[PDB]
Design a binder for this molecule. Structure first.
Ligand code: ACO
Ligand code: IHP
Ligand code: CL
Ligand code: CL
Ligand code: CL
Ligand code: CL
Ligand code: CL
Ligand code: CL
Ligand code: CL
Ligand code: CL
Ligand code: CL
Ligand code: CL
Ligand code: CL
Ligand code: CL
Ligand code: CL
Ligand code: CL
Ligand code: CL
Ligand code: CL
Ligand code: CL
Lengths: 139, 763, 199
């Protein structure tokens, strides 16, 4: 139950679906059409959560009907070990400023704030500006 | 002259088919009476070019001109069996059998030849004679062949005993004598239980039917066969106890859990087992839950549709989409199919949407959503829903094919061809059309041919409705070509199917000798029956029936008369993407010569119909296709025949029958272009058995309104019968404008998919 | 429901279609004939059923073996032909539909094939090859069918993937189908004895 495998650019559409499903305006479509650190969470053959990293947490999502079953945080641990094994101690992520609920509980893991809003980090799908927030951890 | 002959052979063997046949055709003009080693060479050549009837004569002449090679008898036996000349093949078996008595295969061959010639006794004597000669000398390698030849000898005896209990006892004795040497225990047990049933010893048969079930409790056949042996065939109160007692021996197998659902008539109890078969499945989330219970929705919908609806709905009512997500999503998936089968499309979308937005990661949910959209008439949307599903996993070869199907059904042949090319072996080619023809992928070429026929009719109307009032002319020259291009490919892909099934008929050539040396005569006889049904299989008749629309039209349009070449780069480059066969084998890449034919009826006959008609049986014979074919070739005495045979079966109340009679009865007029002798015969035949059905006397009355007769005799609801008349409006004018409108008003009860296609193509 | 029976020549046309929609290795009709006419008691198929409770005719679908009968899976079995050892079988090809997972179709088809391979042809063992990437196949043959992994056969398929050469010795007593009719044990293992009356 709640297993994790890789993407393998055969089922990249899986990942692109989970990123386009949960919080998708920002999620560009040329983004995942380059990649071929990726990892997806499976719930008895059901893809449920995804993770895209850069070396930074570039995306971490889980299906709303399979959250809170410890599943998103399992993807978080995979990112920490990845950092620990690339001889670096900096794991960071950019988040929208209106995203407060995916912060308080999401910052349960040591992830401290760099200091106020950044303004227009990235344009989404429409093309408008989107205030952003930066938090980071250490290995 | 033997030099001009063997050259072709040597020539043929390398690959140059052209001069290979060109050489050989002089070597036969030369003689008119050749050397045996020359007749042998050409017999080997005619066999390779699949000229069996001529190969037999060059092989028969080789011996007639003095030959020593006694293998010509086996070579003649294989070839003669291929053309169905088993009277002459028995002669060849006897001759080769005499020449090599040491090989058991030649005994089995001689026997099989006798068996099919009706000489059932000579076959048994032949096999028995070898049995007695080889007593105590069957080695371990030969034990399989010995087991087959014994079961085969029991097959002949059993078919010769018919229902004679005196003899049926002796075939039972032989079966129990050979049993220690027979390894086909399943077939021996299957045979034994049939004799016990024919012998009336139903108690003994019930013991075998129970042994068979134990050897395979997933086989529905032995379960219900056991019922007849017990006599409880019509006792639901004793069938309930039977399967209940079988539910303990085999509690994982479905026959004990499913067969009760076909006879229980008490709602309370029937609903209990219904709950026991589909609820554990929805618990495990097995996607085929509805597909396993759908037969009940077709044979006894009225008493199983609503009781399953309550069971599943109540089940889902107490489901948590957090907590129990696997059973939650797969119960919505069931309920979506439950309502889709009931044509309750609003609820059908209602239950698939939840499962999808809850779990948009299982491709099954996409196929079902795309399946409902195709029922609604949104082919291009349904195709889009499926391309989303295949984006989830590009390795799934199953979703690709389902996706390729939906793109072909939406006439998107370009997306379809290239989605399919992701799994084909292209190599030194562009797409996968030539590879799909190599692997005999009939699922693709039929769907693509039907798509081309749809695209041809769509661009045809775009030609007529734009020709009705500069570039608005060279643009006509582009569409004038697209209509000829899609019509040819539609017909060139349809003609690719008989090429496959004649290969299936040539593929049994090697088995006339191989099955004998392998010692599988019983499985070989099943191959001869299989070869005599190849042109009746669903894929062959689907291509034939669909291609008849083109051939029949080409004859019907034949009725009333139907800075120059600097664009060939458009045609020459596009011919590289539609090529089906190697360039060294096909020059009519666009079927250009198929659509410009001057004998459309004889092309359809020698490419599809003749081989089908000769093999099809009355049970499954298409009589409407028979009528429509003989009508366009003159045989009116075969049109009433099909209509009479169609009548034997479907009641004189069918609206299709009435339309066929009206069209035929109208051909019995003096102004019609038919043979007056057949006209007189068909008139007599129409009076003899259908005088109390139609006002035959009023075919001469030019003021009789037959549409009004149809209306009052068959209603305005029989869509298919109205469409048949509308097909023959040029030969039988009865108010085409009034007929068209009445067809349109009868489309209200059909689903939007069937209405759209009737309006867009059938009218 | 799903019916499971022996394969006949009248099944191979639909078998080819099933293989063309599922598996990457495709064969000509002549190859299926060479299987079903050389070893006509080894191959098994899994189909749907429509038992009488009206009637119907056959649908012009590439999957219809008979009216109301749809092919969902098959197993193409054969003895070793290649030229010097004891008798041994070989699973040439196995395919089961995606929507008919989680019903034991794959397992049921293989058990009949393994039993028929030992009883009819007296095979000492049966060999096959599995793609390493396919984890669902490794769990089927090895973990539930008691197969054993032998070699690795790096780059065995034409695409470049590494196979899983597996083999299983065949003993009629262990392959008996009546051995795997129950799951949760302990409990009473009630089975038929072919003697007492069922009524
Ligand atoms: C630009 C970018 O890339 S931003 C990344 C995408 N943007 C988003 O807003 C993500 C969308 N939000 C989500 O997908 C979910 O809300 C998540 C990821 C926060 C939840 O992930 P889950 O798999 O459910 O975590 P898990 O399996 O451990 O179970 C939830 C537990 O993890 C905790 N948790 C909350 N947020 C997080 C987080 N970011 N990471 C790890 N754990 C978290 C919760 O406190 C919860 O505790 P509980 O079980 O007592 O209720
Ligand atoms: O046999 P079923 O389980 O009842 O479903 C099939 C369906 O096959 P699937 O199981 O893969 O869905 C076919 O394909 P889809 O359209 O569903 O993708 C479709 O064949 P068609 O191409 O003609 O649709 C057909 O008919 P329909 O969808 O109209 O119900 C339908 O049922 P049949 O077995 O009765 O032909
Ligand atoms: Cl924002
Ligand atoms: Cl009786
Ligand atoms: Cl969607
Ligand atoms: Cl035309
Ligand atoms: Cl061969
Ligand atoms: Cl027709
Ligand atoms: Cl026409
Ligand atoms: Cl003819
Ligand atoms: Cl008949
Ligand atoms: Cl005519
Ligand atoms: Cl071969
Ligand atoms: Cl009824
Ligand atoms: Cl790999
Ligand atoms: Cl597999
Ligand atoms: Cl398994
Ligand atoms: Cl009894
Ligand atoms: Cl009793």
């Amino acid at each position: 139950i709640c297993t994790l495998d890789n993407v393998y650019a055969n089922n990249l559409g899986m990942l692109t679906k989970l990123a386009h499903v949960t919080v998708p305006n920002l999620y560009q479509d040329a983004f995942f059409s380059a990649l071929f650190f990726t990892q997806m969470a499976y719930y008895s053959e059901i893809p449920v959560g995804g993770l895209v990293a850069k070396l930074q947490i570039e995306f971490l999502g889980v299906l709303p009907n399979y959250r809170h079953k410890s599943i998103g945080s399992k993807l978080l641990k995979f990112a920490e070990d990845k950092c620990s094994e690339c001889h670096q101690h900096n794991v960071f992520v950019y988040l929208p400023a209106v995203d407060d609920l995916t912060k308080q509980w999401f910052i349960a893991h040591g992830f401290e704030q760099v200091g106020e809003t950044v303004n227009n980090f990235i344009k989404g799908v429409n093309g408008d500006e989107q205030d952003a927030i930066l938090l980071k951890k250490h290995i | 002259v033997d030099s001009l002959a063997l050259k072709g052979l040597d020539l043929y063997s390398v690959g140059e088919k052209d001069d290979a046949a060109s050489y050989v055709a002089n070597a036969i003009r030369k003689i008119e009476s050749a050397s045996p080693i020359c007749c042998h060479v050409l017999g080997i050549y005619m066999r390779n070019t699949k000229e069996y009837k001529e190969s037999i004569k060059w092989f028969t002449a080789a011996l007639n001109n003095g030959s020593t090679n006694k293998q010509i008898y086996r070579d003649l036996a294989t070839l003669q069996s291929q053309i169905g000349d088993f009277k002459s093949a028995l002669v060849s078996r006897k001759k080769y059998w005499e020449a090599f008595l040491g090989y058991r295969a030649n005994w089995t061959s001689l026997a099989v030849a006798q068996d099919v010639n009706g000489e059932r006794q000579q076959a048994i004597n032949t096999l028995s004679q070898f049995e007695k000669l080889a007593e105590g000398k069957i080695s371990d390698s030969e034990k399989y062949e010995h087991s087959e030849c014994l079961m085969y000898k029991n097959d002949v005896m059993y078919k010769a005993a018919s229902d004679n209990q005196d003899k049926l006892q002796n075939v039972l004795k032989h079966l129990n004598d050979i049993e220690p040497c027979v390894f086909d225990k399943f077939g021996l047990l299957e045979r034994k239980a049939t004799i016990y049933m024919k012998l009336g010893q139903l108690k003994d048969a019930s013991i075998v039917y129970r042994t068979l079930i134990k050897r395979n409790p997933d086989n529905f056949k032995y379960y219900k066969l056991l019922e007849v042996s017990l006599g409880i065939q019509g006792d639901n109160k004793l069938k309930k106890a039977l399967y209940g007692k079988l539910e303990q021996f085999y509690p994982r197998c479905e026959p004990p859990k499913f067969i009760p659902l076909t006879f229980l008539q008490d709602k309370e109890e029937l609903s209990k087992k219904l709950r026991e078969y589909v609820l554990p499945q929805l618990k495990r989330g097995v996607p085929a839950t509805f597909s396993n219970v759908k037969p009940l929705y077709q044979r006894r919908k009225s008493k199983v549709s609503p009781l399953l609806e309550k069971i599943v709905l109540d089940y889902l009512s107490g489901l948590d989409p957090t907590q129990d997500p696997i059973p939650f999503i797969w119960t919505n998936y069931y309920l979506s199919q439950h309502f889709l089968f009931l044509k309750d499309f609003p609820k059908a979308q209602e239950y698939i949407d939840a499962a999808l937005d809850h779990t948009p990661t299982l491709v099954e949910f996409y196929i079902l959503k795309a399946r409902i959209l195709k029922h609604l008439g949104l082919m291009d949307t349904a195709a889009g829903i499926l391309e989303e599903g295949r984006q989830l996993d590009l390795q799934d070869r199953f979703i690709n094919c389902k996706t390729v199907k939906y793109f072909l059904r939406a006439n998107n042949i370009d997306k379809a061809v290239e989605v399919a090319s992701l799994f084909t072996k292209n190599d030194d080619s562009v797409n996968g059309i030539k590879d799909l023809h190599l692997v005999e992928a009939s699922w693709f070429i039929v769907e693509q041919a039907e798509a081309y026929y749809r695209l041809y009719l769509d661009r045809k109307k775009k030609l007529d409705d734009l020709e009705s009032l500069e570039q608005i002319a060279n643009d006509i020259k582009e569409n004038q070509w697209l209509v000829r291009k899609y019509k040819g490919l539609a017909l060139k892909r349809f003609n690719a199917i008989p090429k496959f099934y004649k290969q299936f008929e040539d593929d049994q050539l090697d088995f006339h000798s191989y099955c004998m040396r392998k010692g599988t005569p019983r499985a070989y006889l099943e191959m001869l029956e299989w070869g005599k049904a190849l042109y009746t299989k669903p894929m062959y008749v689907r291509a034939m029936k669909e291609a008849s629309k083109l051939y029949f039209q080409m004859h019907d349009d034949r009725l009333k008369r139907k800075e120059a070449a600097a664009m060939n780069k458009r045609k020459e480059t596009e011919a590289k993407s539609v090529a089906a066969y190697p360039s060294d084998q096909d020059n009519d890449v666009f079927g250009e010569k198929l659509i410009e034919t001057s004998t459309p009826m004889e092309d359809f006959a020698t490419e599809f119909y003749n081989n089908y008609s000769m093999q099809v049986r009355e049970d499954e014979r298409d009589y409407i296709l028979d009528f429509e074919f003989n009508y366009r070739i003159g045989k009116l005495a075969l049109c009433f025949a099909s209509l009479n045979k169609f009548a034997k079966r479907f009641g004189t109340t069918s609206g299709l029958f009435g339309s066929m009679a009206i069209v035929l009865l109208h051909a019995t007029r003096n102004d019609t272009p038919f043979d007056p002798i057949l006209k007189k015969v068909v008139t007599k035949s129409l009076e003899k058995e259908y005088s109390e059905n139609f006002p035959l006397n009023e075919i001469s009355n030019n003021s009789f309104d037959w549409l009004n007769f149809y209306q009052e005799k068959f209603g305005k609801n029989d869509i298919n019968g109205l469409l048949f008349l509308y097909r023959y409006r040029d030969d039988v004018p009865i108010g085409s404008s009034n007929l068209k409108e009445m067809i349109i008003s009868s489309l209200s009860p059909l689903e939007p998919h069937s209405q759209n296609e009737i309006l867009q193509y059938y009218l | 429901p799903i019916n499971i029976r022996r394969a006949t020549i009248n099944d191979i046309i639909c078998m080819q279609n099933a293989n063309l929609h599922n598996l990457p290795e495709n064969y000509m009709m002549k190859y299926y004939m060479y299987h079903i006419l050389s070893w006509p008691e080894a191959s098994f198929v899994a189909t749907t059923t429509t038992l009488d409770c009206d009637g119907r005719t056959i649908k012009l679908d590439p999957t219809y073996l008979a009216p109301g009968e749809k092919l969902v899976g098959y197993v193409l079995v054969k003895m070793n032909d290649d030229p010097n050892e004891p008798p041994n079988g070989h699973i040439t090809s196995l395919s089961v539909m995606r929507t008919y997972r989680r019903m034991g179709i794959a397992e049921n088809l293989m058990r009949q094939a393994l039993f028929a391979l030992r009883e009819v042809h007296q095979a000492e063992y049966v060999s096959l090859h599995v793609r390493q990437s396919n984890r669902a196949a490794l769990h089927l043959y090895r973990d539930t069918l008691a197969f054993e992994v032998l070699s690795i056969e790096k780059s065995y398929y034409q695409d470049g993937e590494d196979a899983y050469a597996m083999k299983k010795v065949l003993k009629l007593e262990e392959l008996q189908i009546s051995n795997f009719t129950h799951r949760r044990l302990n409990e009473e293992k009630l089975e038929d004895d072919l003697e007492s009356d069922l009524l």
